[PDB]
């Protein structure tokens, strides 16, 4: 018995981030979907690119460590640097937390786009089972499963067979 993303993920799937898993009379199989995978991946790189850009270069700055107490001017120098450190520490905590919320949103979306893409291909020939899977109401051999996966599945071919299996 097979399920989809609604239930849980797939440790089985090792050559892609998303993919199809099918059952027909010829057997059962798992294939990865390249478009959806590269979609997600490409936004993880682009933000990994936005982070290794080093606009931070600093030669002569100010003293940050002291040997004797001095009062006013030392107190200020210590304050300026401690203020700078606090503000960048905040920027880092927020940036990472906010990137990460985006990374989750983008990947959750690409999964749903993949599901809806298949939904559209299948028209009135399949019903959504509720578990991230479609029950296909016609015989679908291995060539037919591949057509769904490579985007050439012509729903008109099977519409009569499938509608008659759904309505009676």
């Amino acid at each position: 018995a097979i399920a989809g993303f609604i239930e849980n993920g797939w440790q089985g799937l090792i050559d892609g981030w998303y993919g199809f898993r099918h059952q027909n009379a010829e057997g059962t199989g798992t294939a990865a979907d390249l478009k959806s995978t590269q979609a997600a991946i490409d936004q993880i790189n682009g933000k990994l690119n936005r982070l290794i850009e080093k606009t931070n270069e600093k030669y002569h700055q100010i003293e940050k460590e002291f040997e004797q107490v001095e009062g006013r001017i030392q107190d200020l120098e210590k304050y300026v640097e401690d203020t700078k450190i606090d503000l960048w520490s905040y920027n880092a905590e927020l940036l990472v937390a906010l990137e990460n919320q985006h990374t989750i949103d983008v990947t959750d979306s690409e999964m749903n786009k993949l599901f809806e893409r298949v939904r559209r291909q299948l028209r009135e020939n399949a019903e959504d089972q509720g578990n991230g899977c479609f029950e296909i109401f016609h015989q679908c051999d291995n060539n037919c499963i591949e057509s769904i996966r490579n985007g050439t599945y012509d729903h008109n071919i099977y519409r009569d067979e499938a509608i008659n299996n759904r309505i009676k």
């Binding site: 993920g9 998303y18 990994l48 450190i85 937390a97 990137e99 990374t103 989750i104 679908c140």
Partner: protein, 319 residues
């Protein structure tokens, strides 16, 4: 009878925890650390031109104290001061020590342009038992101790120098503070000295104060180091009736210079790194680091956090 087709995503057995704004503990398939914690422990001499002060700090070197001979004419992006550095000459304080140290560091050069002065009416090239060079009495290589001529008195000095070069001139000079009223008269005949250095822009005058300090390298007196900037066009006048520690020339200033000074006790290796810290070099492409707030060059931003995990994959839901 009916075939099934399911759509899913990948998962791993053991995820990684990351933070969003609302969950401190989201398990994602893959994650990447953004806070660099490793340093090399040796200071990389590439691509930053380093000068190791070794036994001499940047000022002793600029003054020419005994230990510091090598440092002459060295240039640097980063001058390294070691905590083992030591005074080896006549004892001295410097008013605005850290201001002068900054100016010298920024200039990034100990290339001393020598000038010749004719000091009318004084013995030149004074030395002292506190400033040994090969066990023999010496002085700061860049200063000239003036005492009364083996003859009359501290013949009044009114020496001038016009800045004809295109660059700004830094002149290092000083003032002797003798211990006793007798030491003053032995050296300078007069009972009270005076030193007056001045340009068209500004001026300083120091009346030397007599009295006892604790003996340092067997010396109760002190020298006080001062400095004057002289613009192109402008002229400097040294005017003294007693107690001047005359200069031997000037340093170049530029002001359009990026160099600095770093206080580290770490060896100069042969690695490469654009980021130098007091703790060592940083070799990382991460954007943050918890190593040290002291960070010179192209560095990651210093932050307080030890770890900031960046999700590089989707939620892990392994089932």
């Amino acid at each position: 009878g009916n075939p099934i087709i399911c759509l899913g995503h990948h998962a791993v057995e053991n995820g990684t925890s990351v933070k969003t704004l609302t969950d401190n503990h989201v398990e994602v398939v893959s994650a990447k650390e953004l806070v660099e914690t490793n340093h090399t422990d040796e200071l990389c001499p590439s691509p930053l031109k380093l000068v190791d002060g070794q036994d001499c700090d940047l000022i002793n070197g600029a003054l020419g104290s005994p230990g510091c001979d090598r440092l002459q004419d060295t240039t640097w992006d980063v001058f390294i001061e070691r905590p083992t550095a030591v005074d080896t000459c006549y004892p001295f304080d410097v008013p605005d020590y850290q201001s002068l140290r900054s100016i010298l560091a920024s200039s990034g050069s100990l290339e001393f342009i020598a000038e010749q002065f004719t000091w009318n009416g004084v013995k030149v090239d004074g030395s002292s038992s506190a400033c040994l060079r090969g066990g023999r009495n010496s002085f700061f290589s860049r200063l000239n101790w003036l005492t009364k001529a083996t003859n009359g008195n501290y013949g009044p000095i009114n020496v001038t120098k016009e800045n004809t070069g295109s660059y700004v001139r830094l002149y290092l000079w000083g003032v002797h503070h003798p211990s006793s009223d007798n030491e003053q008269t032995d050296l300078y005949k007069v009972a009270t000295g005076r030193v007056t250095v001045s340009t068209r822009s500004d001026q300083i005058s120091i009346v030397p104060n007599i009295g006892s300090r604790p003996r340092v390298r067997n010396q109760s007196g002190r020298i006080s180091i001062y400095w004057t900037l002289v613009n192109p066009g402008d002229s400097i006048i040294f005017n003294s009736i007693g107690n001047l520690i005359a200069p031997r020339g000037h340093y170049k200033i530029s002001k359009s210079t990026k160099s600095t000074v770093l206080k580290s006790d770490k060896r100069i290796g042969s690695c490469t790194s654009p980021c130098l810290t007091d703790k060592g070099s940083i070799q990382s492409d991460k954007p943050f680091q918890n190593v040290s707030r002291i960070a010179i060059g192209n560095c990651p931003k210093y932050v307080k956090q030890g770890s900031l995990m960046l999700a590089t994959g989707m939620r892990n839901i392994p089932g």
